[PDB]
Amino acid sequence: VAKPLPPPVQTV
Amino acid sequence: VAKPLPPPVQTV
Amino acid sequence: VAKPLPPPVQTV
Amino acid sequence: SQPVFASPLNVEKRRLNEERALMQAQKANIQLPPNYGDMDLILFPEGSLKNSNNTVIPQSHLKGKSVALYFADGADPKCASLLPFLLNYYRTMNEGGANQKIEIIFVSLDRDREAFESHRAHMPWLSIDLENPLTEILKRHFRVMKEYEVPTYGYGSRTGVPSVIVIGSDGREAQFLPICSGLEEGDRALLRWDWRNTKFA
Amino acid sequence: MREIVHVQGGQCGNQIGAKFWEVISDEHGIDPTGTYCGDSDLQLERINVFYNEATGGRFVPRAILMDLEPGTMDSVRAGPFGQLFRPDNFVFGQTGAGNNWAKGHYTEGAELIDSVLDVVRKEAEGCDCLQGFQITHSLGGGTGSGMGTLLISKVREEYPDRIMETFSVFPSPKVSDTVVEPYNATLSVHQLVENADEVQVIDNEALYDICFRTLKLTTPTYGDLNHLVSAAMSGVTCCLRFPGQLNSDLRKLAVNLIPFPRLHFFLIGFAPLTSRGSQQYRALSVPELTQQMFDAKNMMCASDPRHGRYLTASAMFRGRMSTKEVDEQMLNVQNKNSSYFVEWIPNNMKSSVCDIPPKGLKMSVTFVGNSTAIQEMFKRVSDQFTAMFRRKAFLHWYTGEGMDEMEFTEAESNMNDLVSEYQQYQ
Amino acid sequence: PDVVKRTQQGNYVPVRPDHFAGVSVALFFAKAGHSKCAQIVPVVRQFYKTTNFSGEKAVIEIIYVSLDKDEQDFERVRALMPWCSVEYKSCLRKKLIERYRVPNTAIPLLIVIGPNGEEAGRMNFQQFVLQRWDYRFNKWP
Amino acid sequence: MREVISIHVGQAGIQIGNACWELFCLEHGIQPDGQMPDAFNTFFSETGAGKHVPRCVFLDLEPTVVDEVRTGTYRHLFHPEQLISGKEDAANNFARGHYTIGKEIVDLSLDRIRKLADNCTGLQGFLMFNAVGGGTGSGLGCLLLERLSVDYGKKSKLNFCSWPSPQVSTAVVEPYNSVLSTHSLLEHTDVAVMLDNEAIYDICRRNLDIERPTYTNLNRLIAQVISSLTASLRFDGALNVDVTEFQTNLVPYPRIHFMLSSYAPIISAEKAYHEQLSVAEITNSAFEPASMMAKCDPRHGKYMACCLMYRGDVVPKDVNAAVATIKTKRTIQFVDWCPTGFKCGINYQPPTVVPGGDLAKVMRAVCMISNSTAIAEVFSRMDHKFDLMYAKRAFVHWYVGEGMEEGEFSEAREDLAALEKDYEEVGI
Ligand SMILES: Nc1nc2c(ncn2[C@@H]2O[C@H](COP(=O)(O)OP(=O)(O)OP(=O)(O)O)[C@@H](O)[C@H]2O)c(=O)[nH]1
């Protein structure tokens, strides 16, 4: 099913 | 009873 | 049970 | 969270504190949800505590003294035996010394308007009135049941009536005086009160 | 986990065990329809000891109703909590072992012993690792003492290392029904001593003494009579189903109560037991409960403890109570009753504490004792036996079914040897 | 809005909808008087007490959805569950039971969700099982 | 690097360790979850981001305590698969906990401390916890102790066994479970400390002035002496003494390594009101004969070795004065082949008390571990109970059905008698 997409890179 | 304190001897 | 933390008193 | 979560004091404690933290965050970096130490609550409202001659006092008078909740009712014969000894324990510790070391707040299980007044007239220390919603929210909060009437949230009754407890500053349970516990010593647990430790600040 | 499989036999046994499931189900929180109410994890974390999930959310007890008279489990179905048992655990009987040990052991002891052993294996290996076998039966009846005893033989020869115990009632000294009492009792006690790990003794009119003196009851009933034997029946295994400060096991009792393998007969008591005139003004404290295990009037067995010495006594406390005046209360009762204890075992008494009190109470205890008081009952059935052989009566209808004269004689050569090894140890 | 309700004795307080920041939200579907959910609703309270209220930060939070056939039956089970619920007259209860493919024996279920609202993880109780949910999975921004 | 691992066996050792690691969790400021809101490395590992994880295995063939800790509030503190539990108890049989139901679980414990030990390199010792009166506390812990001895021969195995009381029993096979295990524990462990029941039971009688505590209340009293014994390892001190110096100092001869315990002061709010607690009377009450944790009355005792560990704001300028008054005291006798028998240690950290418990806080404290020859009376009552059982072959009918054959009872009998006879040449 529609899994929630992961958070992106924190752009360190 | 809870007896009152005396004055603490007023000296020079 | 769940118990507190003793306070880490600063620079004793 | 201390002593339990499923208490009416704690549900309004974190609701007001998280609302306060997020109206400050909306006004202005803070981490959600806040910690327990960041969660500060005014435990006792304005018109709740009163003394003999029935004059109301705010919560701020309880600073510098050990405050003890007293869960009791007149019909219980254990309360009948405990009450004169708690009068004599509230006696001796409090004239002996230079400061008002101890203070007891009373909460009742008396079965109407009149039965509270009869137990009140033999009692000099502070108490709260059975009319307000403060009495039964404290009743669940520190987990006291004379008998299972209000449904509990999975916590069996640690203590029965009579029960005297000592509290800290932010409505925190310090230690149960085991007059009625899983231990049951009668008329002797009163001298377990440790009035350097239990401080209302 | 570990699960006790329950076998329930005889007319007396099917009423005793029915009240057993009536008192365990309502203390664990299960309605007679099979659902649960009680919102406690303590009542649910170990429910597999006696129950099984039915993939419908209900719990079916691991009980085997077995009897040769078809009216006994007919009353179990009609009674309250009578819709817990699976109909497939039921095995029926139509010809009926009519108060007869011989026809209940051999003649109709064959065509039902194959089916009641079928039902016990698929209740046994269906679990991961079973623990023991509790059997409620009678030594006074015919099919409760013969047909259930052949079941004791067939269970052990398959499962030789698991513990098992029998909560068996016994023939009566004073007022006796089912007039072949020593015939049914003693032909079964040979199989009880060589083929059972524990046998716990219950006397019917000793239970009458419980309701007369320590209960102040005018006309009690089998419901109450089986209720006060199911209180101790609950107490012997509630510490298994529940946690505690010093937990305990049926095998925990077994290793340190039975000294030598042939004597394993136990003396079961229960405390507290109150009346309307024994509930209001009575302190419920452990030194008050100390005297009720060591009270001959508070004993469920006819054997007077003052006419003997306790080889090894044990107690299973329950409730919110300190563990130490378990033991100095067991120390001072040992010191004052030193002449009531055996001398060559130091510190005879065993103590264990379960942290769940019986439901509705604050504290209780279940006493189990290996004692040399039990020979009072073992010698009255012995000489009631010897009066039925010097003139040959009532056993020709045993010999007509195969029970010839050979085995009756060593049924006494092992019975008086059983009490001789009892008396030679005092 | 005023659809999800925090428990309080005397008057039911409506919890403000951004209460769920930084915590893992798990929908708990149940029906009162159902036999399987009778032993699941206490042990899911067990994880609610132990896990969440061991540390100062809250880590889990459970929303209650009822399949109950009576409004008074819902009230006396909501007063037993120590986590928040949805009102019996709310739109959200029959929206979520229709979305998440849970019919009116498979019951109960726990479904952890995400901030976007879609499904994140499903596990049943049809038979240590409930331990498999980790509170660090659904951290919400 | 230098770190310590604890092993608990038996439900007595589980309940003791429960009070041990509520109190260490209070002491280091870590949460029951495991996150602090570098002394913690000596009991915990930094498992990822902020989690401190205890180093233990919890062994019990009886599962109702292992899964009840798992249900309890400390479920995220402990790693769920060192909490290995058997299917059924050893049922107070030294036989059953050592041969049949011991084998399938001892291999699950040994491959476990393999991965727990090599988390660091240069490890020091083991805090072994067991009850000697039971079946899986004795049998499984001794089964474990043999395999630890043949695998890691360079460790300091430090076992705290709860010796059975003379009068307080809670069992009747405890004459058999103790005598027959002392044979297989004497040559396998390195440091042992007796903890009788009724001795600490009287300690909370007269010092704490509670008529009637529970088991857990004394496990908190035990957790204090577990704490300050290793608080030298945890926190730095003015003069620190560790586990590895116990072999150099406290044990004269390697056979005799059974010592005692003492903690002082063990007091409450009533007692903290009216006394100063200074080092002079603190070491006097620590050497008071009724504060011993094993009913070992040293009036007819004969001291050889002794180690005291103070903590708090204690200066050595009065530590030397405190031990000087003891040496000049006549009621305490030391042995002639040591000129001095005292070694003192100081830790800067004052103790922490469990909130809601029965100890009030004290600025000063001491734990005392002494080797005396009045250990003979602890084992001579155990001598009298064993042979009165064994005079008529009592209780061995199921021991021989498991693997306790005829003969190991009798050779354990002459080795307990070898331990009795070891006490008087070292006294003479
Ligand atoms: N210090 C301490 N000792 C305990 C505690 N509980 C039991 N004991 C002691 O443990 C001894 C026997 O051990 P058990 O408690 O039966 O546990 P065990 O050694 O694993 O033996 P099993 O019952 O077969 O599991 C008893 O004689 C008690 O003195 C406790 O909570 N604290």
Ligand SMILES: Nc1nc2c(ncn2[C@@H]2O[C@H](COP(=O)(O)OP(=O)(O)O)[C@@H](O)[C@H]2O)c(=O)[nH]1
């Ligand atoms: N405690 C108790 N004893 C019973 C009960 N029913 C019968 N008995 C006793 O058992 C004896 C008769 O056994 P019986 O029931 O006929 O055994 P059966 O031959 O297997 O049917 C009588 O002496 C009764 O005292 C009962 O429900 N409870």
Ligand SMILES: [Mg+2]
């Ligand atoms: Mg055990």
